[PDB]
Amino acid sequence: EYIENWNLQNRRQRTGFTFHKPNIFPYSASFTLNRSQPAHDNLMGTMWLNAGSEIQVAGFDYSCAINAPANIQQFEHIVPLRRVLTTATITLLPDAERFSFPRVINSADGATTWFFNPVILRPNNVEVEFLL
Amino acid sequence: QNYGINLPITGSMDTAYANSTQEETFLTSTLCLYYPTEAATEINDNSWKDTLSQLFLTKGWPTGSVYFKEYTNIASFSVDPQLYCDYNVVLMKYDATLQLDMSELADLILNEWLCNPMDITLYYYQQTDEANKWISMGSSCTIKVCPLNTQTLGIGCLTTDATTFEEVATAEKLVITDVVDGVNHKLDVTTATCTIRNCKKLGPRENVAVIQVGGSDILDITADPTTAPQTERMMRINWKKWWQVFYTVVDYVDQIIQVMSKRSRSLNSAAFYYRV
Amino acid sequence: NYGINLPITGSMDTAYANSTQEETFLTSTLCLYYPTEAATEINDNSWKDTLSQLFLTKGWPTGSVYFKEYTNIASFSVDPQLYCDYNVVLMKYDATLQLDMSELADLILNEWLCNPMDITLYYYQQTDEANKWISMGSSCTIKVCPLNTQTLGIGCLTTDATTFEEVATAEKLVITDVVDGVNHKLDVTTATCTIRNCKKLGPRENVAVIQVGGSDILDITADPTTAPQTERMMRINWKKWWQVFYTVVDYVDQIIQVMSKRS
Amino acid sequence: NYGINLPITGSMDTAYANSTQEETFLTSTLCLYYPTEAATEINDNSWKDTLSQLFLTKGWPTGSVYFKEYTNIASFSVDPQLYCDYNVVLMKYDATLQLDMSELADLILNEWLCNPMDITLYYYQQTDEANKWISMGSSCTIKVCPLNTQTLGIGCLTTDATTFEEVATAEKLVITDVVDGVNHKLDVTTATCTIRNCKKLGPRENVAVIQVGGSDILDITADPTTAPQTERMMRINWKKWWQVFYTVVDYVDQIIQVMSKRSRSLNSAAFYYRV
Amino acid sequence: NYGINLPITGSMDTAYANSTQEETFLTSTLCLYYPTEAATEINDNSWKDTLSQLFLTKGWPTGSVYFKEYTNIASFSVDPQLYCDYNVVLMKYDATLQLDMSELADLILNEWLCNPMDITLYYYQQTDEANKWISMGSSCTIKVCPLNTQTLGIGCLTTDATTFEEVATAEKLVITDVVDGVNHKLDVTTATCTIRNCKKLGPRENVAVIQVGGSDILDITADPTTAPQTERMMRINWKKWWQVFYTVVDYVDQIIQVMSKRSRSLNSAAFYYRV
Ligand SMILES: *[C@@]1(O)O[C@H](CO)[C@@H](O)[C@H](O)[C@H]1NC(C)=O
Ligand SMILES: CC(=O)N[C@@H]1[C@@H](O)[C@H](O)[C@@H](CO)O[C@H]1O
Ligand SMILES: CC(=O)N[C@@H]1[C@@H](O)[C@H](O)[C@@H](CO)O[C@H]1O
Ligand SMILES: CC(=O)N[C@@H]1[C@@H](O)[C@H](O)[C@@H](CO)O[C@H]1O
Ligand SMILES: [Ca+2]
Ligand SMILES: [Ca+2]
Ligand SMILES: [Ca+2]
Ligand SMILES: [Ca+2]
Ligand SMILES: [Ca+2]
Ligand SMILES: [Ca+2]
Ligand SMILES: [Ca+2]
Ligand SMILES: [Ca+2]
C-alpha cells in the first residue's frame, strides 16, 4: 500500500490511505463560559474533549432557560480539521458520558475553583453539518 | 478596557492552581461587626473594642481594619440599613414575635434591589412579574391597596372612599409588599412618614452574612410559599454569654470570610453594569 | 392510569408536548380552606367576590373557585371531607397544638384503606408496620392492654378496666401505634368516638398544607428515624391575613405544579 | 463581567439598525428638576397631571415621567440625589451665586470616589490633581494649615486655630483645591459638616444640566487653562415658565440623543463610597 | 499485629453473608434513659416488668434490656456514664435550656480524649479547632484573662480577678471555645468544679438521642458555618408517654440499624485508646 502510494504521488496522481480510527484530533480538554460572575453560581457555556478520533461536547445552563426567549437556549461547537477526510463512517450518540458527574473545575487563569453538579436532559433539535 | 461589552471566556481544564491568597485578603480588606446595643451592656467594659482588635491581629487583620457599629433593635436598624465596608456580618437575637420582620431584614440586606421612585397621587400602579416588589420604609408606614379592573373601576373598593380600601400594613418601619401581578392598583401610603419605592431584584449580595443568635432556624428570604431555601451565608448559633458569641467569631474568621465573597458590583469590571 | 400489571414501553427522543397547563385550568376546580378568624380581621362581606375576579386573571374560569372555612384544627379534624379537584389548606401555628398538627397532616396527605372494629366482641392486633388505628369523634378515651399466648393480660387485668394503660384522653383525632404481633383487648368510649383499622398507602396528591406561623413541626411518619419534608409541606410568615391571600392568588402556577389530580 | 480584558473586532462593512429610539422611550424613566419659584408662577394643582399627558404624545408611557422639586441651588447642594434613569436639571442664574453653580455642576456631571477624613487625629494631603476634598453639610467653615518637612507650620502656629487661613465660610458645598503634596491640618466645624477625601472618575453620563437665563459661565476643570463646554450644558432665555416647560417636552428627543442611559449607579447617591 | 495499620484488599464479587440482625439481639445489651417524671405519669411499678415482655417479642432476651433514669437534663449532665452496649436516652425539650441540651449532645454523641489542667501553675492556650475546655461539677464559674506576648493582660489585670472576662457561671457542664493560639489565665472556682482540656477524636457510635417534643435545635459543631444533623438525632412529638414507649419498642430494628458498636470497645483497637 505504501509503495503504491509512493509511486502514484510521485507522478502527481490521486492517492489515498485507508485508516481505522485515525488520530486526526489533537488532545484538547477545555471549556467556554458565555455568562459568568465571580461567585460562579449562574453559568452558561460548553465543555468538550477532543482526543484521538472522538468528540464529546456538552452544553450547560444553570437557570434551565427560565428567562430565555421561548425557554430555549442555543449551543454550538465547531471543530476544524487539519487534512481533508473522505468517505467516513461516523457514529453519533445523544449523550456525553464524561460530563455527567459532579466535579470541581478551576477558573480560566487558575485563580479559584468552581462547582458543577449536572442533571441531564435530552438534546433538542440536533443538526450536524460537514463543511468543505 | 471594553467595559460595556460581554465577551466569552475560554480556558483549559489542565492548569496549575495559584497560591493560597487568603492571607493577602486579610492584609487589604476591611470588616464590620454589628451587634444590638444590649450586648455591650452585659460586657461591662469601655475597652472591649480595644480587647477584640488585639485578637484580630492574630488571624492576620491589622489594627485599623475592623470597625464596630451598633443598633438598638431590628425594628430600628431596618428604618435605614446601609452596609459600608468590604466584608461584614450582622448579629440578631431571636424573637418569637418578630417572625416576619427578621425575614424582612434578611431579604433587604442579603439580596440586591434595583429601585425606582413612586408617586401615590398621580398614577395607577401594577407589578409586572415575580421579581417586582414594593419596598416601603420609614417612621410609620400604612398601606392600603384598591385593585382596579380593565375599565378602572374598583373591585371590592370604592375608588373615592379611602375607608373601603384594603389594608396590607400597619405602622411598620419596613414593608415589602407582594400583590397579584398584572392588575392596576390604587394606593394609600401615608407618605408623611413613609416612602414607598418600586423595586426589582437582581442577583443577591455576596459580602454580608447573617448570624441568628439563638432560637429556631426559620427565614423565608424568597417570596413564594412553595420554597424557602437556607443559603450559605445565613446561619445560627446558641448563646448564654455575649463573650462566647464574640470569641467564636474571632476564632473562626477564616471560615466566615470563606462563605462570603467580594461584592461583584464593587469591582471595576461592573462599570456599566450598575456600579463603577 | 396506574398499573402494577400491564407494562408500558414508550421510547426516547420523542417530542415534548405543548404546555397543557392552560387546559388544566379550564377543566378543574380549586378549594381554599381558612380558619374562621381570618374572615374576621378582613371584615368585608364581599371578599369572596373580590378574590374570584383575581383568579380569573390567572386563567381560572368564573365557576371553579370555592371558599370553605373551619373553626380550628381541633374542630376541622373530626371529619375532613376533601372532594374538589385541587385542595390546599391554611393551618395557623399554635405552639401547644404541635402534636395535633402532625396528626391532621398524616390524615390529609396520605391514603388510608380502613376497616371497622368491634371493641366488645373481638381482640385486635396490628400486623404490618403500616397498620395504624385511627379514631374520630367527639371524645375518644382509648385504653389498651397487651396479651400473652394464654389469653391473659400482661400488665393489666382483663376484667378490671381501671388497671388498663391509656393512650388518649378526649381527643377529636387519635392515630395510635402499638407494637406489632401482640393481640390486644380494647376499651374505648364508643358513644362519642369511632375507632377503625386503617392501613397506609401512597400519598394523596390533591391536597396540600400551607403552615402559617412558626417552625416546621411535621413527623408524618411513625418511626423516630425519618421525618421528611416533601414537595408540598410548605410554610410562610404572616402579619396580616389579607396579605396572605395575595400570595396564594399570585403564585398559583407553582402551587398547582407540585400536586396532581384525582384521576 | 469577568472578561473585560479581551479585544473586540468588528467589520467596517456591516449593516445598521432600524433606529432603536421607541424602545428607549417605552422601557425607561425621566425625572426633571425645577426650583420652587416655578410652581408659584405656574399656578396649578394639575400641571403634573397636565404635562405627563404631553409626554404621552412623544412616546413615553404614563408611569415613567416623575417630577421632583428643590428650593434653591444652595439647599439642593446639601445632598444632590439622582433617582431615575434620566435626569435633566433646571436652574436659574444670578450674579452672586457664581462659584456655587460650577460647584454643583461639577459634583453632578462627574463620577466621584469618596473616602472619609478624620481631621482631628491625622494630617492629610492631596496626591495628584484628580483628588479634591468635597465637604457638604448645613454650614461649615474650613481653615487649613500647611506644614513643612519637620511637621512645623508655615504661616500658621499648629496649636492656634486663629493663625490658620480661611477657605470656606458657611457654604453648603465646598470643593477645595490645595497644593498637591504638602501635609496639612484642618479646622472644619465637624458638628455641621462632613469632609471627604474624594477622587475624580469619568463623567456621569445620564444627567444633563439646563440653566435658565444669563450667560454661559461655568468652570468645571480645576485648572484655569481649560474651561470646556460639554454636550450636556445648555442655556435658555426665559420670560415665563410655560415657555420653558413646553420647550423641554417638545425637544425631548434632542436631549435623549445626548445622555446615554447605560450608566445607572443603582443607588440614589451622587458619589461613590470607598468602593 | 495490634498497632501497625496494615491495608486490606477485598474483591467486588464476594457474595453477601446472612442477615445477622437476629444474632445481635441475642448477645448484646440495651439501656434506656428516661426522666424521672415518666414514671409519675405511668402510675405503675410493673411497667419495667411489662415492657420486658414486649422486648421479648422483637427478639431480646429477658435479661438484656436495662432501664436507667435521671431527674433532669441539668442533673444528668453532671457525669453522664453510659455503660451498656447500645444506649438510647430520650430528653424533653425546653425553650429556655436551648444551649444546655446541645452541650449535652456534644459530649455524648462524640468521643473526647482528655488531659488534666492545673490553673494555679500554668497558663493555657488552645492549639487547633479540636481543643475545647470541658468543665463539669456541682457549680462551675469560669473566668478568662487573655495575655499578650509579654505576659500582660489585654483588658484584664493579672492580679485583680474582677476585671476578668466571664464565660459561664453556675452550670453543670460548660464547653468553652476561646481564640486558638493565645495564652490565657483562668479563674475557675475549683471547689465544686473540675476542668480539663479535651480534643475531639470522632463520633461515639453506640448511642442515640431522641428529642421528645419541640422544634429542631441541635448544634454539635461549635462553629457558626456548620450545624450538621446526623442519623443518630431523632425527634418525636408527644402527647402521652405510653405512646412514646410503644414507639421505641416497635422500631428497635431501625434504632439499632443506624448505630454501630463502639469502635474503642473492640479488641481490635488495642493500642488506639481502648474503651
Ligand atoms: C506565588 O508566589 O507562587 C506561585 C507558584 O509557586 C506563582 O504561580 C504565583 O505567581 C505567586 N503568586 C504570588 C504573587 O504570591
Ligand atoms: C400556544 C403554544 O404553545 N403553541 C403551540 C405550538 O407550538 C404548536 O405547534 C401547536 C400545535 O401543537 O399548538 C400550539 O398550542
Ligand atoms: C427601515 C427599516 O430598517 N425597516 C426594517 C423593517 O422593514 C423590518 O421589518 C424591521 C424588523 O425589526 O426592522 C427595520 O429596520
Ligand atoms: C439465605 C440463605 O439461603 N442462606 C443461608 C440461610 O438460608 C440459612 O438460614 C443460614 C443459617 O445460618 O445460612 C445461610 O447461608
Ligand atoms: Ca373593601
Ligand atoms: Ca407580584
Ligand atoms: Ca397496669
Ligand atoms: Ca405498629
Ligand atoms: Ca496665617
Ligand atoms: Ca490639588
Ligand atoms: Ca475588663
Ligand atoms: Ca478555639
Side-chain angles (χ1 to χ4, degrees), chain B residues 145 147 155-158 163-167, chain C residues 42-47 50 242:
Chain B
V145 175
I155 299 171
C157 52
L158 184 62
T163 302
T164 61
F165 290 169
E166 289 86 3
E167 186 176 2
Chain C
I42 293 172
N43 65 11
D44 191 0
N45 291 319
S46 67
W47 62 272
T50 187
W242 184 255

Side-chain angles (χ1 to χ4, degrees), chain A residues 35 41-45 59-75 119 121-122 124, chain B residues 130, chain C residues 16 254 257:
Chain A
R35 181 179 66 194
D41 54 354
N42 190 0
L43 298 172
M44 181 179 72
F60 58 93
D61 189 2
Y62 288 2
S63 66
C64 195
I66 192 63
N67 292 319
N71 297 115
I72 288 171
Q73 182 62 43
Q74 181 69 40
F75 297 106
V119 298
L121 283 77
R122 63 177 177 86
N124 193 3
Chain B
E130 70 273 14
Chain C
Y16 291 164
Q254 297 293 322
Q257 188 177 4

Side-chain angles (χ1 to χ4, degrees), chain B residues 127-133 177-182, chain C residues 250-251:
Chain B
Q127 292 182 357
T128 62
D129 59 355
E130 70 273 14
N132 194 357
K133 300 296 186 290
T177 300
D178 191 1
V179 297
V180 62
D181 295 332
Chain C
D250 192 1
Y251 292 159

